[PDB]
Structures are given as structure tokens and as C-alpha cells.
Amino acid sequence: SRLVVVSNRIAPPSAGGLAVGILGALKAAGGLWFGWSGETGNEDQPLKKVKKGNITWASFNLSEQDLDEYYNQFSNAVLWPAFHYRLDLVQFQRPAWDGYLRVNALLADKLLPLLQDDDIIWIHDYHLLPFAHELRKRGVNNRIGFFLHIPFPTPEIFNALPTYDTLLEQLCDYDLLGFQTENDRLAFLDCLSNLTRVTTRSAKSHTAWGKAFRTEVYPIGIEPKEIAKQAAGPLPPKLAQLKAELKNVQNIFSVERLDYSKGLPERFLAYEALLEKYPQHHGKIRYTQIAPTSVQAYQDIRHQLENEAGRINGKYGQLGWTPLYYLNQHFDRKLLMKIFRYSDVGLVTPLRDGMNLVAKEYVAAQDPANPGVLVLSQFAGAANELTSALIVNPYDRDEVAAALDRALTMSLAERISRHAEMLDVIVKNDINHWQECFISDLKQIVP
């Protein structure tokens, strides 16, 4: 009954999505959240532990050597590019792999004293693929679940990983494997079937190497009521009536962190295609891209976007109208929801994404009586449930431009029908439904 959640980082005591589902789950049956605390260079202090009623937060530190091999190298320079279909950015070196295993084993040993024979164990992202295997080696027979938040790549990409067979064997030490989308789940079952013979009943009960495990799809959601609440309050004063400076302007908006998977250079090119082929919008629209920086792997993306902002404004700008507002600034989350609400078009076009929550935040932030339009990549995991969005292939910049123009001229009637139907999807499958389905499936496993 008691729940042990292990994630790459814990939250001190809402302000996000996955934190709400993990905390909603930990209050439902009590338990422990175990995770990295954020700091480095002093590892051997005892377990930082904070207790509040039903739940205990347990955290640790990491040496600089472990963090770079495990987290900066293997997790973020091998697994992350590969799972987002970018083998050309994979930098595999065997020391990083060995360090990835060493950190996973080291946190299995920190957690082992805190476990009880009855706990169900919930492990989160790709940083901790080997964690179950490390716990089984210590005799942990509990019900263990894994949830992958990013895509799982198809075999011809995944098997190019030098340690792909070890990764696959360790994934099968979990009793339950969760995925954002059905394509991710089937991708993993294909990679496994290329490596070993797999038995499947119903659709989601499996055996490989004699190990029994289930797979399932649990698309992660948001809490829509809180987004609507932050979105409908009034603005900062200086920002209160820039809504009032720009009454004559339609705003296309997007907010994304800088990453190769998000395809931000291609959005700029889609916006340039809109300016080149629909000149009737000149002086009457604006594209605003907010892209905070938080790693030198990501500055070459930042350099390219600065260049493309300058080039596009240089080419289509006027003495009194600049087409593209690019902001490399941090905005507080409660202001972004208001910007979502007042933006006529939300543009969410990553090249590969496990689940884009910005897309759901944008829909949950709209005024239902006068909502904006969501333009969504078909490679966003959210595209499988947000079918009434304007779905686009970001590799076709004219098709995205055509969707932007359609979004900018769409009648209120069709805006309401599309928004109401996406909102129903998001409300029915919210963050709280997500954690309940996963905990309910995890409990009913037999050890």
C-alpha cells in the first residue's frame, strides 16, 4: 500500500504538472519521495529528510564526477538525443555508461534501507532506466513501476545505441512499464522482440527472458482548474494594458525551452513562410517566442534563433512594425497563462516530443467564450488526444504557414467547437486521473 516514488529530483514542499501528480499520489496512500536534491560536491552527508504528515521527502547529493558522466553525459548526451531520433547528436563513451550504472546502483543502495516488503515503487524518467534491475539484485521483490516521459525510439534508432541490449534487459525487471503514447509502447515492444522472443496476451501482458511484466499507456495531463484560475486574474500593471497597446494586433505565441527536439528554427521558417505568402497579415500580426536559457549543448540553438530573428525582422520588418518578438527571458508561470489566454494562436510544433504540456496549458488557459487556436505538431504526443487542434507536419513550412493563416482567420463558432472538444479531453484525463490509473495498475500486479 505505501508508495515509494523515485525521480531524478524532488520538490521541496500549484507550480507545475508532474509535481502535482506525484504529490497527489503520495497523499492518497502515504509514502516516500526519494530524489536528487540539486547540489554537488558533498555526497557523504546523511540523507536530507523532511517529513510532513502523510509523506516524507528524502534527498541526496552527487559528486561532480558522477553528475557529468551519469547526467550530463549518458542521460543527456546519449539517451536523450537517441530517444528524440537524433543519433547524429549521440556522444557515447564507455566511461559515461559505467558512470550511469554506478549512480543508479549508488541510489539503489541509499534507498534500500528505507524500503518495506509491501511498498509499491514508482520510478520516473530515463535517468533511472537501470534502477529496478539494481533493486532486484538487492533482493527487492516489490511491485515496481516505470514511467517514461520522453518518446521511446523505433528499433533502427534504438539498436544503434552501443548498450541497447543491456538497457532492454533491465527494463524488463520492472513489473509495469508506462508510456506517454501507444507508439512509444509499441516501439519498446518492437525493440525487445528484435532482441529476444516475447510472449504477449491480451495486448499488454508480456514475458521475455522468463520475466513477466506489463506495459500500458498513460498520457500525462495538467490540472485544468488551476490553469484557468491563474489565467483569468488581472495582469501586472505595466503589462495590464499592453494588452491595451496591441488591440489591432493578432498574437501568435509559443513558449518552449531551447532544445533540438523542439524545432524552434523551423517555426521561425514557418513564420517567414507566413509573411512571404500571406502579405495581407503584414503590420497586423506578431509572433512572440519566449525561450528561456537554463548547458552549452543548447546555446548553438540559441545562436541560430537570434540569427533568424534578426534575419526575418531585417527582411519583413517595417519602420513601425516588427514581425517577430524573440525573448530569451524567464517569465513567471502565472503570467504565461495570462499571455496564453490573450494570444490568438498557440503554436506548439516540436519535431519530437513525448508529451507537450504547453499545448494543454494553452487550451486550459483560454476564455471558453472566446478561445484561441492551437496549432500542433503531429509529432507531439499530445496530438493523439488533441485531435481538434490544427495538426501540422513541421517539416512542411508552407503547411504550418497555411495552418497559421487558417488559425488567424477562424470564426468564433469553429474556435469554440475546437476548443470545447480539446478542453473535454484535457478535463477528463487530467493529472489526477493519470496518477490514479498508474497506481491502480501498479497495485494489482502480483509479486
Residues facing 347 on adjacent strands: 375
- Nearest to a copy of itself of 248, 411 (CB atom): 248
- Nearest to a copy of itself of 299, 417 (CB atom): 299
Residue 16: HSE in the Cβ half-sphere, 13 Å Cα cutoff: 9
Q: Is 353 a catalytic residue?
A: yes
> Active site residue: 127, 149, 206, 281, which one?
149
Q: Which residues of this chain interact with a copy of itself, rule CB under 8 A?
A: 238-239, 241-242, 245-246, 288, 291, 303, 305-311, 313-315, 317-320, 322, 325-329, 339
Tell me, letter by letter, the H, E, C secondary structure of the chain.
CCEEEEECCCCCCCCCCHHHHHHHHHHHHCEEEEEEEEEECCCCCCCEEEEECCEEEEEEEECHHHHHHHHHHHHHHHHHHHHCCCHHHCCCCHHHHHHHHHHHHHHHHHHHHHCCCCCEEEECCHHHCCHHHHHHHCCCCCEEEEECCCCCCCHHHHCCCCCHHHHHHHHCCCCEEEECCHHHHHHHHHHHHHHCCCEEECCCEEEECCEEEEEEECCCCCCHHHHHHHHHCCCCHHHHCCCCCCCCCEEEEEECCCCHHHCHHHHHHHHHHHHHHCHHHCCCEEEEEECCCCCCCCHHHHHHHHHHHHHHHHHHCECCECCEEEECCCCCHHHHHHHHHHCCEEEECCCCECCCHHHHHHHHHCCCCCCCEEEEECCEHHHHCCCCCEEECCCCHHHHHHHHHHHHCCCHHHHHHHHHHHHHHHHHCCHHHHHHHHHHHHHCCCC
- Nearest to a copy of itself of 63, 322 (CB atom): 322
Q: How far is the CB of 340 from a copy of itself (least distance, A)?
A: 13
Q: How far is the CB of 309 from a copy of itself (least distance, A)?
A: 4
- Nearest to a copy of itself of 372, 381 (CB atom): 372
Q: What angle, 0 to 180 degrees and rounded to 10, lies between the N-to-C axes of helices 333-342 and 357-365? A: 60
Q: How far is the CB of 323 from a copy of itself (least distance, A)?
A: 10
- Nearest to a copy of itself of 85, 342 (CB atom): 342
Q: How far is the CB of 406 from a copy of itself (least distance, A)?
A: 25
Sign of the C-alpha dihedral, residues 181, 183, 187, 190? positive
> Active site residue: 353, 405, 430, 441, which one?
353
Q: How far is the CB of 326 from a copy of itself (least distance, A)?
A: 5
Q: How far is the CB of 134 from a copy of itself (least distance, A)?
A: 43
Q: Is 330 a catalytic residue?
A: no
- Nearest to a copy of itself of 45, 329 (CB atom): 329
- Nearest to a copy of itself of 280, 318 (CB atom): 318
Q: How far is the CB of 357 from a copy of itself (least distance, A)?
A: 22
For residue 99, what are the CA distances in angstroms to 70, 74, 394?
Answer: 5, 8, 36
Q: How far is the CB of 389 from a copy of itself (least distance, A)?
A: 24
- Nearest to a copy of itself of 216, 344 (CB atom): 344
Q: Which residues are catalytic?
A: 149, 353
